[PDB]
Design a protein around this ligand. Structure first.
Ligand code: CHL
Ligand code: CLA
Ligand code: CLA
Ligand code: CLA
Ligand code: CLA
Ligand code: CLA
Ligand code: CLA
Ligand code: CLA
Ligand SMILES: CCCCCCCCCCCCCCCC(=O)OC[C@H](COP(=O)(O)OC[C@@H](O)CO)OC(=O)CCCCCCCCCCCCCCC
Ligand SMILES: CC1=C(/C=C/C(C)=C/C=C/C(C)=C/C=C/C=C(C)/C=C/C=C(C)/C=C/C2=C(C)CCCC2(C)C)C(C)(C)CCC1
Ligand code: SF4
Lengths: 213, 73, 742, 41, 159, 79
């Protein structure tokens, strides 16, 4: 509840309203462009979602290959697999560039619909989507689409537990953002995956912490 | 000099030169009779044309005499 | 306090204001009755503070115009890089930089101009460039045309980006006046962010890629066998082969034991003995120091985080006895007027350009730069002209501010008021010192000319007759020559070779630099420089001070900044505004800079450059005839103009033909300027009537009545043509001389 | 689209389009019929 | 010492200032005690003093740097040139006195002091006053040139 | 290395310089200076946790200044 004063906009409403803004990037006085108070929470939400989805996959191969489950194709470093050619790359069933354009073609559909639901809330439920026209209407906030598909189990029924789930999600997203930043950084001063860094820190911290390079 | 720059600059210069002459000791015992003013407009054009013409005549008379008489054809 | 301020979508982007040509100003938005509408349209097309009156729209327009200018500069840079990539003999130049003339432009064969593609070497045919881009790319570590192509594309991207921003911040998200006024945070971010982080990033690039590649280029290896600039990033061992200090990792920097970085972070004067340029191991250290300097200097001014200075308590605190109420009321001047900022910025940027032009020739920072004489002369002349233009612009904008932004109801703060209240003294003393300098500088030349004409050279002011040795410059030279032993114990050598100390350095024949002597011929020309600079300051300062009122016209500020004259009365009041003082000062700036560049050209060709042979014998280009022949105007006529002008005139039928053509073209333009500079509007307006008569006689009378150019546009056209002709003549002469004989 | 045509109907734009087309024409003629001093007709 | 700049005589509507250069005790004393500003003394004596000073100082730039500065007539040519300059200046002073002064006008000189005391104007701004000034200046200049030459190129004590 | 003199100055300088954001000493966020070095403003806006004096910004400034001084002293003990 500290490290800043709740000036005029961080009253306590949003999930994770710890009243932290020493610069004033949500201040509603000058809000046009991309830093209005309606785009910043959404951006934090989905950046945290992607960080939560990436900070697990960055370690998953390296930690699974230690259990001997996966064959020896799991690159112990998260970066020796395609994503950066010059430091090592793995050969998949296609060129990394045709994989890239296929990924962009599959993601354009996934992202333009979401953008149109943000800019036009009720839309994306009117135009006949090819094949099974699915009910993907903008059921409320553009960051919580609800729906019978984006909520398989309906976890969260009324306001209390739903708000608790939301604040848990934003906190885990911030943690995962910091985790992937740590991945990126300590992949440079060490030269090896993060799980190996944790193991070598568990070995002996007196001679293996950050103050050794 | 007399054809490009015009009077309103030189008069505003003389007006402070006269001040500087008046407000100095040991040199305000002397005194001008005719008030110093900048040359007139047509007078400036005339002086400029006279300079242009004298220079034009002289720098070519000198050249035509030196380049020829120095070789005599 | 300090925050982001934006007004969402203040102007709808459309084409409506685009179809109506005159739209910004309502006085000429109606339509072109006469033909003096087409002219003033372009005249006040950029007069943002004249169309409207609120500082907010003016500031937004200024911002977007800056973005457009940046986009144009990015297009220019990407074009230069693409030309260096596609139509340049760069790779061939890299294999032999001492026998291959740079060239990055080719000409289509259409009408016989094919001969402009001269034989520059390396199997190439094209115009020989003098921009110095090849040396810059060699110093950057660029070693392949590919590495150019990419960056070209890069530039293009930024161009588009800039354009986008330029649109965005005017049409979608434009700030409001209260945002631009935060000068404290603006200076904080330009010091710490733009200059500090920029210098740090360039020091990083240097220390990582530019040092090993250039060192391997100095060791004589093929530019194709040199590893790529990333093999030194992902292999600290391949880089430590040259500078083994890298083997110690990033530990010395963090334990303050970084005195072991003396391999690549050096402090050594002089030039590299094989490239004739500075040590890149020295420029890396320089940039590393400058970066932290600007970074710690970017924390001075107060933001919304409690600490820091405020540039209003700093100003008011300086208020002495002699100077009234001190610097009070100047923070209100430089945050509510765009002109009082443009004046200071233009003055400082022009002076800085002059400093750059003086430093670069004396301490060549790029490899094989001091060897190529054409590049080293063009980089001096161009920058000198740029600075000379910028200072006059500063004067003009200070005059504009004084004319239509100054007001006394708040300027009772006796600093600007006090200097305004003794202008009749300031200008009088400046006039006296200008006269004194003019006499005691030019009369000496006239004395020398008359004596050498009267067969009595013993009465001249030469170095054999009565001497005028500049003792202070000689003492400064001798002091800097001994600095690395007493006043700079860690620097291995003096900062430059132009100081009397040191010795000569060769780059394979032609000489790079050597100690420069200073005799009477230098005393005279330095005093002439001082005199011309003083006269220019006289004109510009007189205009600026008398921009508001004078004894002749007490209400000149009502007339405005730009107006021809207040009648033929009071004897005559032609050319009485500040615009006319800028018009008059442009010519003296031209005179001064032309004298400076002539000085530099002759002195360098006479006492610096040349081609040394074995056993040490060095013969300069002209033969050291500057100390003796530059003391008389006749010497500047024959030994400099007549002698050195013998290359351009007879360049017909050669690869240097365009210079010979542009010589006469610029002469024609200069002489054409005199028609506008000497004549007046009335004669031409009358003559036009007798042509309109012939037109009416045949029913071809235009509806836009042909009026003649205004009294101010005539002067503008005259000075523009004059400057173009003069500078282009000197351009052609200098290039056609130095390309052939250098 | 109408205002775009009006803008393209301005004096500088029509001038530069006309002069560029004429320059292209003359340049092509001189690249195909070079060194013409006397009319061979 | 608070604020050293002041308008002339405390009147803001005159063209100048009382800066430390113009108005100051030492400067006002040094400037009042000069012969051209001593009012009551007869013009002839002031002219004699001024001519003496000027003719004595003028021998320098004529002898050291002349056309005959490298001959046995080194000092004599410079002294003659100085005498020529002082007689030319005497002629200019004479024609100025004729053109600027009448033989009936009382005085063009100021009459008041710095505090408005009704003093008497300087007799130098009369026609006969300027004539006496010119004669005394002629004599003083000739005598000063002669004395300078005597001290330099007849006796000891080089410089 | 923690026991060496090279590290003994960077800690001392940073602590002594940090003894101004809490106790009335060298200027910080909540205390401004004056042309006479009066050190009497006692006005700001910033949320801290303790009674008064030390905030979240002035700590960084005190640390940076102490680090500049400590680096200067460590590199000045080379002559
Ligand atoms: C031409 C044309 C252009 C420029 C577009 C533009 C687009 N359509 Mg498309 N369409 C076009 C033809 C047509 N669209 C559609 C109906 C759709 C649908 C249902 C969708 C698109 C979508 C898209 C996007 C797919 C791009 C991508 O991710 O890869 C893109 C913005 C997708 C999108 O996300 O847009 C918001 C999407 O879901 N289009 C029809 C039938 C009416 C077309 C007929 O020619
Ligand atoms: C964050 C970046 C990102 C994203 C969103 C995706 C997204 C996707 N990848 Mg993918 N991929 C990435 C980076 C990414 N990839 C990288 C860096 C590599 C290594 C070169 C791969 C290698 C890869 C393979 C080998 C395959 C995918 C496949 C897929 C798709 C599975 C559904 C999906 C569109 C699969 C697919 O084509 O479907 C598949 O077979 N990816
Ligand atoms: C000529 C150089 C110069 C001078 C004379 C000052 C002088 C001053 N600074 Mg200062 N400062 C400087 C450069 C300078 N600074 C630079 C380069 C930066 C970066 C800063 C950043 C800075 C901060 C952040 C603060 C000061 C403050 C102060 C004031 C109190 C310091 C003191 O006396 O103890 C004092 C007037 C303090 C203050 O309150 O000033 C009003 C303060 O908080 N300075
Ligand atoms: C930072 C640089 C800078 C900036 C932003 C400005 C900005 C401005 N200046 Mg300014 N100025 C500058 C530098 C700058 N100037 C310099 C360096 C000088 C000294 C020469 C001047 C001298 C100057 C004067 C004398 C005047 C201005 C005026 C103005 C204002 C209107 C300008 C306008 O509409 O021009 C529109 C632009 C044109 C009409 C273009 C004219 C074409 C030029 C002269 C020829 C270019 C030749 C080219 C290089 C090559 C020729 C060959 C090729 C064409 C074939 C505007 C605020 C005017 C004003 O009233 O201010 C309020 C005004 O009267 N300026
Ligand atoms: C070659 C041409 C030329 C010359 C000689 C001058 C000379 C001068 N200009 Mg100038 N000017 C010119 C062209 C020229 N201008 C042009 C083309 C322009 C248009 C842009 C201007 C615009 C301009 C401006 C805007 C200003 C000047 C100023 C000045 C004066 C500067 C003071 C000085 O140095 O005195 C030195 C004088 C000389 C070196 C002249 C030669 C004197 C000789 C050596 C002495 C002869 C000995 C003896 C007297 C001869 C007696 C003869 C008798 C026996 C018959 C000076 C009189 C400035 C001014 O008024 O400042 C006072 C000023 O503000 N001019
Ligand atoms: C190299 C310089 C130069 C050039 C190219 C011209 C060119 C021209 N002048 Mg010209 N002029 C010049 C210098 C120059 N002038 C100077 C220095 C003056 C003295 C002020 C004049 C005074 C002048 C007058 C008074 C007239 C011309 C006229 C003309 C035009 C005559 C028609 C022609 O030849 O085509 C032409 C545009 C005449 C004109 O307008 O043609 C109809 C005309 O009446 N000029
Ligand atoms: C009234 C003036 C005038 C006239 C009558 C001509 C006439 C001619 N020029 Mg010419 N020219 C002129 C001015 C003129 N020019 C100027 C001012 C320039 C400088 C830009 C040129 C530059 C020029 C070139 C570069 C060439 C011509 C060529 C020609 C010839 C045209 C052949 C063709 O395309 O069919 C023809 C004899 C062409 C030719 O083949 O000449 C025989 C050719 O190559 N001219
Ligand atoms: C270049 C100019 C010049 C030159 C060569 C000389 C040269 C000389 N001066 Mg001299 N002087 C000059 C300017 C010059 N003066 C000026 C401007 C003043 C100020 C009025 C004086 C005041 C002055 C005094 C007061 C005396 C000299 C004396 C001398 C002589 C011995 C020193 C020497 C001949 C001395 C002399 O000749 O005494 C016998 C001496 O007493 N000078
Ligand atoms: C050089 C003189 C110098 O030292 O200036 C010192 C003096 C400034 O003294 P003050 O203490 O009044 O000024 C300090 C502040 O008040 C701002 O200038 O300047 C003047 O008196 C005006 C200068 C005119 C100079 C005439 C030439
Ligand atoms: C009371 C308290 C406490 C204690 C305290 C402490 C412990 C603190 C810490 C803090 C600190 C201890 C701080 C520090 C800081 C630091 C800083 C902030 C740094 C900075 C840096 C910089 C700035 C750098 C830069 C540089 C470089 C890089 C090089 C060159 C030079 C220089 C140096 C400039 C605790 C928390 C426990 C708890 C609560 C209460
Ligand atoms: S310029 Fe126009 S105004 Fe000034 S004098 Fe000549 S005519 Fe009269």
């Amino acid at each position: 509840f500290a490290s800043k004063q709740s000036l005029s906009y961080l009253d306590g409403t949003l999930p994770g309203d710890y009243g932290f803004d020493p610069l004033g990037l949500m201040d509603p006085e000058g809000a046009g462009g991309f830093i209005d108070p309606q785009w910043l929470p959404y951006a934090e939400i989905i950046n945290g979602r992607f960080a939560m989805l990436g900070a697990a996959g960055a370690i998953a191969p390296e930690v699974l290959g230690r259990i001997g489950l996966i064959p020896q194709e799991t690159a112990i470093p998260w970066f020796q697999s395609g994503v950066i050619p010059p430091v090592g790359n793995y050969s998949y069933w296609a060129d990394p560039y045709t994989l890239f354009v296929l990924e962009m073609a599959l993601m354009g559909f996934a992202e333009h619909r979401r953008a149109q639901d943000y800019y036009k809330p009720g839309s994306m439920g009117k135009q006949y989507f090819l094949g099974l026209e699915k009910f993907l209407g903008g059921s409320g906030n553009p960051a919580y689409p609800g729906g019978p598909i984006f909520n398989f189990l309906g976890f969260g029924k009324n306001e209390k537990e739903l708000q608790e789930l939301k604040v848990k999600e934003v906190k885990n997203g911030r943690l995962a953002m910091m985790a992937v930043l740590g991945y990126f950084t300590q992949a440079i001063f060490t030269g090896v995956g993060p799980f190996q860094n944790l193991l070598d820190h568990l070995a002996d911290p007196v001679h293996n912490n950050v103050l050794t390079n | 000099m007399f054809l490009i720059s015009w009077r309103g600059y030189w008069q505003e210069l003389i007006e402070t030169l006269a001040w500087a002459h008046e407000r100095t000791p040991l040199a305000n015992l002397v005194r001008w009779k005719d008030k110093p003013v900048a040359l007139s407009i047509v007078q400036a054009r005339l002086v400029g044309l006279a300079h242009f013409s004298v220079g034009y005549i002289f720098t070519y008379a000198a050249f035509l005499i030196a380049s020829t008489s120095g070789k005599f054809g | 306090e300090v925050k982001i301020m934006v007004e969402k979508d203040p102007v709808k982007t459309s084409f409506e204001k685009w179809a109506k040509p005159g739209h910004f100003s309502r006085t000429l938005a109606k339509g072109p009755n006469t033909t003096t509408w087409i002219w003033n349209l372009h005249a006040d097309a950029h007069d943002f503070d004249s169309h409207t009156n609120d500082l907010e729209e003016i500031s937004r327009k200024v911002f977007s115009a800056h973005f457009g200018q940046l986009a144009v500069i990015f297009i220019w840079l990407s074009g230069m890089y693409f030309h260096g990539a596609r139509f340049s003999n760069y790779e061939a130049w890299l294999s032999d930089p001492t026998h291959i003339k740079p060239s990055a432009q080719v000409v289509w064969p259409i009408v016989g101009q094919k001969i402009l593609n001269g034989d520059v070497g390396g199997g190439f045919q094209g115009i020989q460039i003098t921009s110095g881009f090849f040396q810059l790319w060699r110093a950057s570590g660029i070693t392949s045309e590919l590495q150019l192509y990419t960056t070209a594309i890069g530039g293009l991207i930024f161009a588009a980006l800039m354009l986008f921003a330029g649109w965005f911040h005017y049409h979608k998200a434009a700030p409001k006046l209260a945002w631009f006024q935060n000068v404290e945070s603006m200076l904080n971010h330009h010091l710490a962010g733009l200059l500090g982080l920029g210098s740090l990033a360039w020091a990083g690039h240097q220390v990582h890629v530019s040092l090993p590649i250039n060192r391997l280029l100095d060791a004589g290896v093929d530019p194709k066998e040199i590893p790529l600039p990333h093999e030194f990033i992902l292999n600290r061992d391949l880089l430590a082969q040259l500078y083994p200090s890298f083997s110690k990792g990033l530990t010395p920097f963090f334990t303050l034991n970084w005195s072991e970085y003396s391999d690549f972070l050096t402090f050594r004067g002089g030039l590299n003995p094989v490239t004739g340029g500075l040590w890149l191991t020295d420029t890396a250290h320089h940039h590393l120091a400058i970066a932290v300097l600007f970074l710690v200097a970017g924390h001075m001014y107060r933001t919304n985080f409690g600490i820091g200075h405020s540039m209003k308590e700093i100003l008011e605190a300086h208020k002495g006895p002699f100077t009234g109420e001190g610097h009070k009321g100047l923070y209100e001047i430089l945050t509510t007027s765009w002109h009082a900022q443009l004046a200071i910025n233009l003055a400082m940027l022009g002076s800085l350009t002059i400093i750059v032009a003086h430093h670069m020739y004396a301490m060549p920072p790029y490899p094989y730069l001091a060897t190529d004489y054409a590049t080293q002369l063009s980089l001096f002349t161009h920058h000198m002209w740029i600075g000379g233009f910028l200072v006059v612009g500063a004067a003009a904008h200070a005059a504009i501010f004084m004319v239509r932004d100054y007001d006394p109801t708040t300027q009772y703060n006796n600093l600007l008021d006090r200097v305004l209240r003794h202008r009749d003294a300031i200008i009088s003393h400046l006039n006296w010192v200008c006269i004194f300098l003019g006499f005691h500088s030019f009369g000496l030349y006239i004395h020398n000319d008359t004596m050498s004409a009267l067969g009595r050279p013993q009465d001249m002011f030469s170095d054999t007759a009565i001497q005028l040795q500049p003792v202070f410059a000689q003492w400064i030279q001798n002091t800097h020559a001994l600095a690395p032993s007493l006043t700079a114990p860690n620097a291995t050598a003096s900062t430059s070779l132009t100081w009397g100390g040191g010795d000569l350095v060769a780059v394979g024949g032609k000489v790079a630099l050597l100690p420069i002597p200073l005799g009477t011929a230098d005393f005279l020309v330095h005093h002439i420089h001082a005199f011309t600079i003083h006269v220019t300051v006289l004109i510009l300062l007189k205009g600026v001070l008398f921009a508001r009122s004078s004894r002749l016209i007490p209400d000149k500020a009502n007339l405005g900044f730009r107006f021809p004259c207040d009648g033929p009365g009071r004897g005559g009041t032609c050319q009485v505004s500040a615009w006319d003082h800028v018009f008059l000062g442009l010519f003296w700036m031209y005179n001064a800079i032309s004298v400076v560049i002539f000085h530099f050209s002759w002195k360098m060709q006479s006492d610096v450059w040349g081609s040394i042979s074995d056993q040490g014998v060095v013969t300069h280009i002209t033969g050291g005839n500057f100390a003796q022949s530059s003391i008389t105007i006749n010497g500047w006529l024959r030994d400099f103009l007549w002698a050195q002008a013998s290359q351009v005139i007879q360049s017909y039928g050669s690869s240097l033909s365009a210079y010979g053509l542009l010589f006469l073209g610029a002469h024609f333009v200069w002489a054409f300027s005199l028609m506008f500079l000497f004549s007046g509007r009335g004669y031409w307006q009358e003559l036009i009537e007798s042509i309109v008569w012939a037109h009416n006689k045949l029913k071809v009378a235009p509806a836009i009545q042909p009026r003649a150019l205004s009294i101010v546009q005539g002067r503008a056209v005259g000075v523009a043509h004059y400057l173009l002709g003069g500078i282009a003549t000197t351009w052609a002469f200098f290039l056609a001389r130095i390309i052939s004989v250098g | 689209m109408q205002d775009v045509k009006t803008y393209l109907s301005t004096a500088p734009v029509l001038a530069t389009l006309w002069f560029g087309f004429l320059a292209g024409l003359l340049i092509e003629i001189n690249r195909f019929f070079p060194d013409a001093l006397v009319l061979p007709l | 010492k608070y604020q050293v700049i002041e308008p002339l005589n405390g009147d803001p509507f005159i063209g100048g200032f009382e800066t430390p250069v113009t108005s100051s005790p030492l400067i006002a004393w040094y400037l009042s005690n000069l012969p051209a500003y001593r009012t009551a003394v007869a013009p002839l004596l002031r002219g004699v003093e001024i001519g003496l000073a000027h003719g004595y100082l003028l021998v320098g730039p004529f002898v050291l740097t002349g056309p005959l500065r490298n001959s046995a007539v080194r000092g004599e040519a410079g002294s003659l040139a100085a005498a020529g300059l002082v007689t030319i200046l005497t002629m200019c002073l004479t024609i100025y006195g004729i053109a600027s002064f009448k033989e009936g006008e009382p005085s063009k000189a100021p009459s008041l002091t710095l505090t408005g005391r009704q003093k008497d104007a300087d007799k130098l701004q009369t026609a006969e006053g300027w004539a006496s000034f010119t004669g005394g200046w002629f004599f003083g200049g000739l005598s000063g040139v002669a004395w300078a030459y005597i001290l330099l190129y007849v006796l000891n004590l080089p410089y | 290395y923690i026991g060496s003199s090279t590290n003994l100055i960077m800690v001392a300088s940073t602590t002594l310089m940090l003894f101004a954001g809490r106790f009335g000493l060298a200027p910080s966020a909540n205390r401004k200076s004056t042309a006479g070095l009066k050190l009497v403003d006692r006005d700001s806006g910033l949320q801290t946790g303790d009674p008064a004096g030390f905030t979240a910004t002035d700590t960084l400034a005190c640390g940076a200044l102490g680090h500049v001084i400590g680096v200067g002293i460590v590199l000045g003990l080379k002559a």
